[PDB]
Symmetry: D2
Subunit: 469 residues, 4 copies
């Protein structure tokens, strides 16, 4: 005479919103990462598991040697396909309710699917072939592979393209604007703003190419990697071929040698590459913050906006700073996953399950940063007057070309002579010209050196920018 | 003739729930971290900023030399106090709406508060003293200090206490249960299960003590740390004393030397300590996973629960594994914050703002782990039959006490003789006894050695457990 | 009337030996890393800088448009080549002595080379073309590229090959030896020892391939990347072509877009890949330590060797443990370099110079680990008697194939029925057979299930091993 | 008829010098870390193990209940003490030679000591009491504790004191020199150079205090922590008291609850604190590099020194950059040790042995950085002319005090009015004065505001500096 009790209730209260979320990835920045909610959330994971389970059953049906699962009629195929396509938050809630009993999420998916097909006698007939011979990780690893492939193609690389193109566009806009370079933070041989942008774009494109080349791997092969259960029931089926077909049919590259888990090395490869690109963008964010500090760039201001609570005058590079901070966090999460995921005790331990729930987290921080950098870039206005005025107060940078021309034409101790003239000393255009005048150089060379200025001492910068891409 | 437009709309859709959250801290494990939503979320932060701003105004009112802010009547004090106490998600939404204009969160709080007091003429009268002389970071750093102090006292240390007490309780339960120790993974000198628990408890208590000792610091001193604006308006007020009073009135310890920001070293100290404790718990989780693998512990099973999707027999230490994975993630976030927060360019850069929104994240993962370890511990059942049977097959561990007794009584080359007998060799009780019998030892010593067994060769283990705490 | 003083003395005392070295990479393990001393030490770096500087001068000589550096006679070519080939520790000491004056290592190399060619009037004649138009980083980045290429081809990949081959050899040796698998540390579906080795080998080969594919990059282009000085002196020479020719002539891949430094992204790519391989080897070291703990492997013992200071019986997996610890350290250094090197302020800051002196350190720890794993592997002896005896006490692992066969043949609730029989329960061969006997299965299937044993329930393990490579 | 062979030769060649060392800690910077060679090298470790072993024997001799080790005569005490005091590299070489046989370093120390006392019949008589009841880790953990205590007191804290005092000295030198502050890299409320130094000094002193407070722990208690062997041989001796006495007699704090190893949590505490201090110094190095870039500081130049291979004019902050890079490396090593050392499998695994050989490495990098920062500081010369000229071009920073004074005196919308005047706009002294003139403020307040300048708008900066320490 057991009476109704509610230990199994799965209740989503009204407590969670972007205002009360602990993580800013779902809180303050929840709107910037909305693409990931369909991919890396518990809903997204459940949805991919359902897809993989349905596809597995469908392959068993279509395989001629598995006689106990007859080929499905159009009607049946459509009902299964709709389970996948129309998978809802209510469906997810059903699975969560079942898990309150099973304390096992994939077995809950299995029981959810057995409940789903109960009313269609043709599907109900093959109900015990749902999850046939599979281990939970057969379902999970393929789900994660599909999640990462989706994220890469639909979210990550499109943002990388916007950043590369945006920075390439700064290179073009500013191709011929001279810049007093800084090495060790000190005035050095001039470049152009555009050439400094070109360098970054070039670095980013290398990683873009590498991210596309990373293999996304998947496996399907039973409890510990050897098709034991498959062969026990169907010794005459070539499960090794079946596996390769199934994985590749999902658009995933096949990993034939595994334990219970797919080993996750490809995740470390994907994430090492995202992290390199993020590091390039940290470098860019910091450099631009620095060019803004030097007044080489001004930033556009927006009506109603407030720069500082106390200092009315402030216009700050806040978008680059937000980006820089989130890329740090992204990398910290990505590095942890990359280092930790590929170590699993013996034929596996379960530490990777909770950690893999965080795939979207590391990626989330990065997406938030990408959008911020993009915002900050749209506000940049180059300060040509400042750039040129600074160059015009740094005539000592012509010590290099003077000493190099002197070397060409056999003057004794050229470097040493210019060190004497300039190191720790203020020398202006007249000072540099008088020095050139006293040199034993051919007149045409003297004329060339007297015609140089810090602002035109830019070497091949403009042509480099023109040759990019 | 401007017409209504909606660029300023702050709309929270119905999109976010625990099912669709990107982070499992708000998703799968959202229910385990509900305490943090009132502390570290955007709502929690806004709520503390409001408290600090209201308290600042109240101190200006109560200070006799600030004549322009007259002392508040009971009525006024109560209205301000209710703003703080009854601060709502709708209030937070007002602040977010204002931020859509200001693009500055603390100035939005200021404008929100000016709107709030507009209808009370006594408060409206001193409206321009809201945020008086303050910089945003005066408000923020004190908010974060209050958040961390709350988390420490109300959330973190209570969980640490449950774990310490729980492990101390395993020490008591199992005080006298002999264990074949393992060093380098190999059979070694016996201990007891309880003594192995005692060691862990002792380590955890050291960190508990240290976390309580960490200073939680706060400052209030204007745009760059020097009270410039305060002194400009009120040169005769001792702002240095005012600062110390205000900070300490909030229950925070005073940091008198700062730039625009509080430097965050105390956050690194708090987090380094949480990380050490988490590392001790990783060690414990891994060791218990190992004792379960060896069958020294069985785990209780629950009706309806599923151990494996394919392997019906499985009972797995899933709670320890979940804990172990989340403690890794906790530490990775905590370490990043600890290393990054205390470096800020010149009088500050804004990278710390977005990073500090993640204080609850590192703490969230740890809380999820603490609860899991606690769950896994409640399921442990010691397997005395297995422990004793293993000891009874490892008589070679008596080589140590035999050789040490031989050393006491002047027998030549004792270690070397036992190495010869036992290293790489199987020796049972009869083999060990026959060896003892052939030794030139006093009879009472021979009798003592013949009476030892691996299971009683436990030294001072039981008394150590009894002396703990 | 200045008198002799000794501020410039460069004195190498007798203080440093492997016994007194602070780092164990030069101390305790100095003999394991002797290959790196010719590559990554200050001597090795100086030697490569000298090579690059000499090669630069030689290209200027051979270029028809640089008329001021006439083509070198055979005599001259040979004297320059010998400077490079016969570069000595005394030469390095000369450079260090010069640096005591210059406080600049590359300018010291330049002055060292000007001193070296002073006695050959043909070389002395073009003395001011040593380092012509170059910046220190033109010399350094190419040196580091040559160092990394040498390390990869001569040291790293050969060790990776020994490990891959060694582990593949364990796969072959042990192909058909059944193993009770462990998932979550618990008895699971059997595999073979050889198949577990095969998985690791397969993972390692993926990284081997990737390390070979990483680009090793170099640049040469003057103070800030734009050939400014080159064009100032020789505007009619195509320096962009000259650069590509020179870099590729050294066997390095060309990086055309740089600041003063080569940006170091390729170093992060090389090191991310070494780190993934090291992580795979940590996983292997830990698993083997675990198989040794379980007594699945015994280790061979050596005459005179001591297992423990106190416990005469001990034979420990010390080589795997040494490897595991050093791979941790390797990864920590490699990760730091990978994350830090590619961020450099504006056209560069000097933080990368001291950090790049540590390239050999991260690599050193890894080499020490590789040798240790190799040593530990040479000592492994499989314990077939233990492996088989364990399998024979774990008949519950046949619950999986029984339930899967039941699913094939339409028996109701197969998983649930086996969960009832086995979860948390001891069932032996007779218990499993009696259960099978009571099942409504075709006789041939019943006979197949009654003929299975944990030791033969190994699926496709043996054929997988045979198909590897 | 065995013939002489040389498998046991321990040969230190002539290969290793500072020029050929792989690590720059023994190579390029070998001279900066010479203090650590007596502490953390293999020689240093061997020397401390010898000390601990000799002290253990001496306590057994002096204990009245251990009748088999008679109290030592003065002669004997002196011979043992000299073994410790006069321990040589030849002695270390003897131990290494023995290890070629034992493959066990502590047993080699034991055999080395048995050989050492063989000629003194009184010591030879108690030869089998060398290492009595001890496990290797009893000897090792106490050695490491003594190494860390020595490093802390003799090396680390003295350098921290030099840095704190040096920075405090910059605070004094520059107390009243106004600085245009930068927040988000943008011109903000002025401070003084000295006050910016004071903040850093204050942070460093907090860590200095904390490093002194960290407990340095040690244990002595046999193979697995329970005195098993001690009690087997001497059941009537109170070993728990003996342990506490012995450890504290060495000047180490007692850790009574351990496995085979001391758990290393105190090492994580020491290293977390060094890392916080190093992070404060990274912040300082970066800020000073930035003040040098802005020309707020010039650096003194030295005769003969070279700033750049190509750019004769360069004077670079190379000492701060060297420091910054080495502090990164220090922290990476320290963090790895702190995270990894306290996790050891069951009653211990041997991964900590090789890792603990690196204690001096993390500390080495830090020492190299400390010396560099000290060098760079000795070269600083403040550029008052530049600092003041910059302030005089940044009159917009007076928007803050103007708006705050306006708030005091009830002017409508003060912040908003100053935002309108200054945000994104150039306003000079005349512009600011004309704005003040038009304000409805009391004349004395108008006069105060008209008398302010960016250079005197420094609030309480000077008094703060005066109050430091
Ligand atoms: Na079929
Ligand atoms: Na594994
Ligand atoms: Na008042
Ligand atoms: Na700072
Ligand atoms: Na030529
Ligand atoms: Na850069
Ligand atoms: Na005695
Ligand atoms: Na442990």
């Amino acid at each position: 005479y057991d009476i109704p009790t509610t230990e199994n209730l799965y209740f989503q209260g009204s407590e969670l919103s972007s205002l009360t979320a602990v993580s800013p990835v779902d809180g303050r920045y929840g709107d910037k990462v909305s693409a990931l909610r369909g991919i890396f959330s518990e809903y997204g994971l459940l949805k991919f598991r359902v897809q993989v389970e349905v596809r597995w059953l469908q392959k068993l049906a279509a395989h001629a040697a598995i006689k106990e699962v007859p080929a499905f009629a159009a009607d049946a195929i459509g009902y299964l396909d709709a389970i996948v396509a129309n998978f809802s938050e209510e469906d997810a809630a059903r699975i969560k309710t079942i898990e309150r009993t099973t304390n096992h999420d994939v077995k809950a998916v299995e029981y959810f699917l057995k409940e789903k097909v109960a009313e269609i006698p043709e599907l109900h007939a093959v109900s015990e072939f749902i999850h046939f011979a599979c281990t939970s990780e057969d379902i999970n690893n393929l789900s994660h592979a599909l999640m990462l492939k989706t994220a890469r193609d639909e979210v990550i690389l499109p943002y990388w393209r916007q950043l590369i193109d945006g920075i390439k566009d700064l290179a073009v806009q500013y191709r011929d604007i001279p810049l007093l370079s800084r090495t060790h933070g000190q005035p050095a041989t001039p470049s152009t703003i555009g050439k400094e942008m070109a360098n970054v774009a070039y670095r980013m494109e290398r990683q873009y190419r590498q991210l596309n080349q990373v293999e996304i791997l998947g496996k399907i092969n039973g409890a510990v990697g050897n098709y034991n259960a498959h062969i026990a029931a169907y010794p005459e089926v070539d499960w090794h071929q079946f596996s390769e077909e199934f994985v590749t049919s999902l658009g995933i590259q096949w990993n034939p040698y595994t334990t219970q888990i797919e080993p996750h090395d490809y995740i470390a490869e994907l994430f090492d590459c995202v992290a390199r690109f993020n590091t390039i963008l940290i470098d860019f964010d910091r450099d631009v913050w620095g060019y803004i500090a030097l007044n080489h760039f001004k930033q556009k201001t927006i009506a109603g906006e407030i720069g500082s609570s106390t200092m009315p005058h402030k216009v700050n590079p806040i978008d680059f700073e937000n980006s820089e901070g989130n890329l740090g966090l992204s990398n910290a999460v990505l590095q942890h996953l990359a280092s930790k995921l590929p170590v699993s005790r013996w034929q596996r331990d379960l530490t990777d399950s909770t950690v893999l729930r965080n795939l979207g987290v590391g990626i989330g921080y990065a997406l938030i940063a990408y959008q911020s950098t993009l915002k900050g870039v749209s506000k940049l206005e180059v300060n040509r007057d400042h750039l040129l005025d600074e160059l015009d107060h740094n005539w000592e940078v012509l010590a290099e070309p003077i000493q190099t021309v002197m070397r060409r034409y056999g003057i004794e101790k050229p470097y040493e002579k210019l060190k004497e003239l300039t190191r720790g000393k203020r020398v202006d255009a007249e000072g540099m010209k008088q020095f050139i005048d006293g040199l034993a150089l051919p007149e045409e060379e003297k004329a060339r050196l007297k015609a140089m200025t810090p602002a035109n001492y830019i070497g091949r910068a403009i042509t480099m920018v023109d040759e990019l891409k």
